[PDB]
Amino acid sequence: SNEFTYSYLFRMISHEMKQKADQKLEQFDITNEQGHTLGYLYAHQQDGLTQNDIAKALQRTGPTVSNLLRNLERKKLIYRYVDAQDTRRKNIGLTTSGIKLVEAFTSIFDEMEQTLVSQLSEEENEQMKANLTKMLSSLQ
Amino acid sequence: SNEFTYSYLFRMISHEMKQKADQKLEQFDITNEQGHTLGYLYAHQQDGLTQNDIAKALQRTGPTVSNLLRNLERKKLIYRYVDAQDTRRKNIGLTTSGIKLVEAFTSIFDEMEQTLVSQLSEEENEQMKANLTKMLSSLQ
Numbered sequence A, B: 001s002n003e004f005t006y007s008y009l010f011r012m013i014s015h016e017m018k019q020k021a022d023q024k025l026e027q028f029d030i031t032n033e034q035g036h037t038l039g040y041l042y043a044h045q046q047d048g049l050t051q052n053d054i055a056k057a058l059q060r061t062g063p064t065v066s067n068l069l070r071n072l073e074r075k076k077l078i079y080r081y082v083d084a085q086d087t088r089r090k091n092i093g094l095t096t097s098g099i100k101l102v103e104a105f106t107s108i109f110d111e112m113e114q115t116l117v118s119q120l121s122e123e124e125n126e127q128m129k130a131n132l133t134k135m136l137s138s139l140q
């Protein structure tokens, strides 16, 4: 409808999506930082990740990353295994519970997006995302 | 672009609009409640508003409204004048500084909206607002 400002519609949609996601998030009890770490591992552990690599990629310091990985390992969401190429070296990866956790978190957003996408045709979705991007561009 | 989720675009646009509005808002130093009161007065003072009317419309109690109007009157943003129809009665309205303040606040959003609207054609804007409303509908 034309009775609403873009500000209102965007505020409400964003608020609602946030509320749903948050209500879904309160049962993980894991840190934002740790969530980002687990997601990075989900996306890149096939590269054989070391602590330093995680530090660089996360743009955090070594001891902070150490703290995170220590806490995640305590929770049994990650583990360290001997490198297949070089048995001298160790790599960090997800455990089963970690993979499950990342997939759940991600499924929340994938389902939300799919819900939104299914309301419009492919062309309508394409036009919508393009106009949204133009608008945001107009906001910077 | 299709590389972004609706969640991202809506979060960013809403965040940005919020940041701009807030940065514009920090120089009024007046309450949210008082802002709403002043806006209601801007929209309806021609009806000859009484304290009770404001209470009903704002869905607040009498003494709370009294507190608000007391503070607004202290700041010289509102005033009480004798009713033209019934000199027995008094009405609440904006002063000059109040009208100016409401117009400034409102101009922030009108300008923001106009900025957003000018990026798209009228048909594009109409389609966009309609799809946004459908989507929000899909979120409730």
Ligand SMILES: CC[n+]1c(-c2ccccc2)c2cc(N)ccc2c2ccc(N)cc21
Pocket (backbone or CB within 6 Å): A025, A028, A030, A031, A032, A033, A034, A035, A036, A037, A038, A039, A040, A102, A105
């Ligand atoms: C970095 C995004 N992010 C956030 C997050 C951090 C800050 C603000 C907003 C959301 C997050 C927040 C909570 N509570 C739980 C899990 C995650 C998470 C999990 C995985 C991932 N790949 C990114 C994640």
Ligand SMILES: CC[n+]1c(-c2ccccc2)c2cc(N)ccc2c2ccc(N)cc21
Pocket (backbone or CB within 6 Å): B025, B028, B030, B031, B032, B033, B034, B035, B036, B037, B038, B039, B040, B102, B105
């Ligand atoms: C009621 C909207 N609202 C809010 C507001 C309140 C709560 C949350 C968000 C914005 C507001 C917040 C500040 N700081 C200053 C002025 C106003 C305002 C002013 C006029 C109006 N007609 C509505 C107004």
Ligand SMILES: [K+]
Pocket (backbone or CB within 6 Å): A044, A045, A046, A047, A048, A049, A050, A091, A092, A093
């Ligand atoms: K790895």
Ligand SMILES: [K+]
Pocket (backbone or CB within 6 Å): B044, B045, B046, B047, B048, B049, B050, B091, B092, B093
């Ligand atoms: K009045």
